[PDB]
């Protein structure tokens, strides 16, 4: 294929390249602490008007 | 309380969003998997992404140091975000094949 | 197909939005003609149709 | 007023990558090699200087009189500001638009009436043997939005009267405020004082980074000839 | 003395360096890194640059 | 200059047929099977 014919001849031909495919996917970014002040707007003690 | 449906008080509220002309900083939660060591897989490591294998590594950081490139300005080196631990990025096995 | 105005600029190949990517997504590779032209006239009611 | 001369000094890490014993050429706002920097003995001294694509700040005290860094293009009573203050707890950095006054000075006198503010990043850490006095460079700049602040704290011994001293040291990066503020004028305040500002323009830099990922010397391009051809 | 040799393997190096040079330098476009690329901008204009 | 899986390496030395890398060479020699040496 890489050398179009139906008779090769004799020697050593670089075909294509190897190279191992992943397996797994990895998807880390910093740890959650700095959270919006949420709770003060929905549990909050007085509402508005 | 005597008063039914549509009588009763609702407490409303509105999360108005502006996305206005300046550097974003209200962003949304993003998912965290765990970290393999021996075996070539895909990192996303705070938007480096790229393929290639995460093992250890003894190159001493700095603790404003985040990333790490080659002499050929070539990934070889990460610092994970949740544990400060410096990896070392290495390329999937590769190579040519000759018949 | 019948959309809205804001919406026709999606109808090209390759577009991000609404209707582009959940309702009709054509390929990149798209060879033709996209035909569109404002029709409130008939396709509209009082209090919407 | 004066003037001195920054032999090698005024020069840090553009971008946070680990490099080990390689030379990396980068082009970015740093400051010229033996150039001619604003010198002002506070021993009063406090003018308004104009911030100008990056300042190079450089404290050489004894004692903590020097603290407080003022920003903001018309900072009187219409845009915001950037007070990057420190007295003996924390750092009390809070992007705000407030009334000014004409001489700053340290309570917390600068503010004269605060209002509707946008952004504060108070933190514990702050950024502060003998006769041996203190160097404190600073390096500010504000490429897109976010307003760099680098620095580096060493020891000196006052040989020749108040002069900045010769050696390399690279600065670190602390904060990376990301703020919006048109940042266009700056203003010192305080509480052997040594007011160093040096301005910073484009210029390319040769970095020789250690095998323990550290900037030894640099080469000013700019400089002379030998610079060109190394 | 020995000029003659490390020519030829300075003069393979040297051409060694510049292809791993000229993978970072932008032929005209918005950056180098093509994972860059294809995560601001629109398929139909990402295959342009 | 790799993993030449297919051959067999015989102590024996002849001229080279096929160069394969590092003074390694291949040929089609007697049961008729590809050898190394």
Same mark, same amino acid.
């Given at each position: 294929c890489?050398?179009?014919?139906f008779?090769?001849?004799?020697?050593?031909?670089?075909?294509?390249?190897?190279?191992?495919?992943?397996?797994?996917?990895?998807?880390?970014?910093?740890?959650?602490?700095?959270?919006?002040?949420?709770?003060?707007?929905?549990?909050?003690?007085?509402?508005?008007? | 309380?005597?008063?039914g449906?549509?009588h009763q008080?609702?407490?409303?509220?509105?999360?108005?969003?502006?996305?206005?002309?300046a550097?974003?900083?209200?962003?949304?939660?993003?998912?965290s998997? !765990?970290?393999?060591? !021996?075996?070539?897989? !895909?990192?996303?490591?705070?938007?480096?992404?790229? +393929?290639?294998?995460?093992?250890?590594? !003894?190159?001493?950081?700095?603790?404003?140091?985040?990333?790490?490139?080659?002499?050929?300005?070539? +990934?070889?080196?990460?610092?994970?975000?949740?544990?400060?631990?410096?990896?070392?990025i290495?390329?999937?096995?590769?190579?040519?094949?000759?018949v | 197909?019948?959309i809205?105005?804001?919406?026709?600029?999606?109808?090209?190949?390759?577009?991000?939005?609404n209707?582009?990517?959940?309702?009709?997504?054509?390929?990149?590779?798209?060879?033709?003609?996209?035909?569109?032209?404002?029709?409130?006239?008939?396709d509209?009611?009082?209090?919407?149709? | 007023?004066?003037?001195?001369?920054?032999?090698?000094?005024?020069?840090?890490? *553009?971008?946070?990558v680990?490099?080990?014993?390689?030379?990396?050429?980068?082009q970015?706002?740093?400051?010229?090699?033996?150039?001619?920097?604003?010198?002002?003995?506070?021993?009063?001294?406090?003018? &308004?200087?104009?911030?100008?694509?990056?300042?190079?700040?450089?404290?050489?005290?004894?004692?903590?009189?020097?603290?407080?860094?003022?920003?903001?293009?018309?900072?009187?009573?219409?845009?915001?500001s950037?007070?990057?203050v420190?007295?003996?707890?924390? &750092?009390?950095?809070?992007?705000?638009?407030?009334?000014?006054?004409?001489? *700053?000075?340290?309570?917390?006198? &600068?503010?004269?009436?605060?209002?509707?503010?946008?952004?504060?990043?108070?933190?514990?850490?702050?950024?502060?043997?003998?006769?041996?006095?203190?160097?404190?460079? @600073?390096?500010?700049?504000?490429?897109?939005?976010? @307003?760099?602040?680098?620095?580096?704290?060493t020891?000196?011994?006052?040989?020749?009267?108040?002069?900045?001293?010769?050696?390399?040291?690279a600065?670190?990066?602390?904060?990376?405020?990301?703020?919006?503020?048109?940042?266009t004028?700056?203003?010192?305040?305080?509480?052997?004082?040594?007011?160093?500002?040096?301005?910073?323009?484009?210029?390319?830099?040769l970095?020789?980074?250690?095998?323990?990922?550290?900037?030894?010397?640099?080469?000013?391009?700019?400089?002379?000839?030998?610079?060109?051809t190394? | 003395?020995?000029?003659?040799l490390q020519?030829?393997?300075?003069?393979?190096?040297?051409?060694?360096?510049?292809?791993?040079?000229?993978?970072?330098?932008?032929?005209?476009?918005?950056?180098?890194?093509?994972?860059?690329?294809f995560?601001?901008?629109?398929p139909?204009?990402?295959?342009?640059? | 200059?790799?993993?030449?899986?297919?051959?067999?390496?015989?102590?024996?030395?002849?001229?080279?047929?096929?160069?394969?890398?590092?003074?390694?060479?291949a040929?089609?020699?007697?049961?008729?099977?590809?050898?190394?040496?």
């Amino acid at each position: 294929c890489t050398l179009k014919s139906f008779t090769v001849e004799k020697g050593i031909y670089q075909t294509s390249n190897f190279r191992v495919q992943p397996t797994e996917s990895i998807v880390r970014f910093p740890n959650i602490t700095n959270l919006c002040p949420f709770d003060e707007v929905f549990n909050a003690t007085r509402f508005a008007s | 309380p005597t008063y039914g449906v549509g009588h009763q008080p609702y407490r409303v509220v509105v999360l108005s969003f502006e996305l206005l002309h300046a550097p974003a900083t209200v962003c949304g939660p993003k998912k965290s998997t !765990n970290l393999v060591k !021996n075996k070539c897989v !895909n990192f996303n490591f705070n938007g480096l992404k790229g +393929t290639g294998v995460l093992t250890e590594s !003894n190159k001493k950081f700095l603790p404003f140091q985040q990333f790490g490139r080659d002499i050929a300005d070539t +990934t070889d080196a990460v610092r994970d975000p949740q544990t400060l631990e410096i990896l070392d990025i290495t390329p999937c096995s590769f190579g040519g094949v000759s018949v | 197909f019948v959309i809205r105005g804001d919406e026709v600029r999606q109808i090209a190949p390759g577009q991000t939005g609404n209707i582009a990517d959940y309702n009709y997504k054509l390929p990149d590779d798209f060879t033709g003609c996209v035909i569109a032209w404002n029709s409130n006239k008939l396709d509209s009611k009082v209090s919407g149709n | 007023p004066a003037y001195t001369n920054s032999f090698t000094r005024g020069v840090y890490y *553009p971008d946070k990558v680990f490099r080990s014993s390689v030379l990396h050429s980068t082009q970015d706002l740093f400051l010229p090699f033996f150039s001619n920097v604003t010198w002002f003995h506070v021993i009063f001294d406090n003018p &308004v200087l104009p911030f100008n694509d990056g300042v190079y700040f450089a404290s050489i005290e004894k004692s903590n009189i020097i603290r407080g860094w003022i920003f903001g293009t018309t900072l009187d009573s219409k845009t915001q500001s950037l007070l990057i203050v420190n007295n003996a707890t924390n &750092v009390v950095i809070k992007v705000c638009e407030f009334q000014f006054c004409n001489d *700053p000075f340290l309570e917390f006198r &600068v503010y004269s009436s605060a209002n509707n503010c946008t952004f504060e990043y108070v933190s514990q850490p702050f950024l502060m043997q003998g006769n041996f006095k203190n160097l404190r460079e @600073f390096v500010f700049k504000n490429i897109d939005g976010y @307003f760099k602040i680098y620095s580096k704290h060493t020891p000196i011994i006052v040989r020749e009267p108040e002069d900045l001293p010769q050696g390399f040291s690279a600065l670190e990066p602390l904060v990376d405020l990301p703020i919006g503020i048109n940042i266009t004028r700056f203003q010192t305040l305080l509480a052997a004082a040594a007011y160093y500002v040096g301005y910073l323009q484009p210029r390319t830099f040769l970095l020789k980074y250690n095998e323990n990922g550290t900037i030894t010397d640099a080469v000013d391009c700019a400089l002379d000839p030998l610079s060109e051809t190394k | 003395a020995l000029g003659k040799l490390q020519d030829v393997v300075n003069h393979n190096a040297q051409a060694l360096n510049t292809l791993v040079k000229q993978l970072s330098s932008k032929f005209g476009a918005i950056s180098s890194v093509l994972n860059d690329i294809f995560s601001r901008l629109d398929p139909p204009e990402a295959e342009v640059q | 200059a790799g993993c030449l899986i297919g051959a067999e390496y015989v102590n024996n030395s002849y001229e080279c047929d096929i160069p394969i890398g590092a003074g390694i060479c291949a040929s089609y020699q007697t049961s008729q099977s590809i050898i190394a040496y």
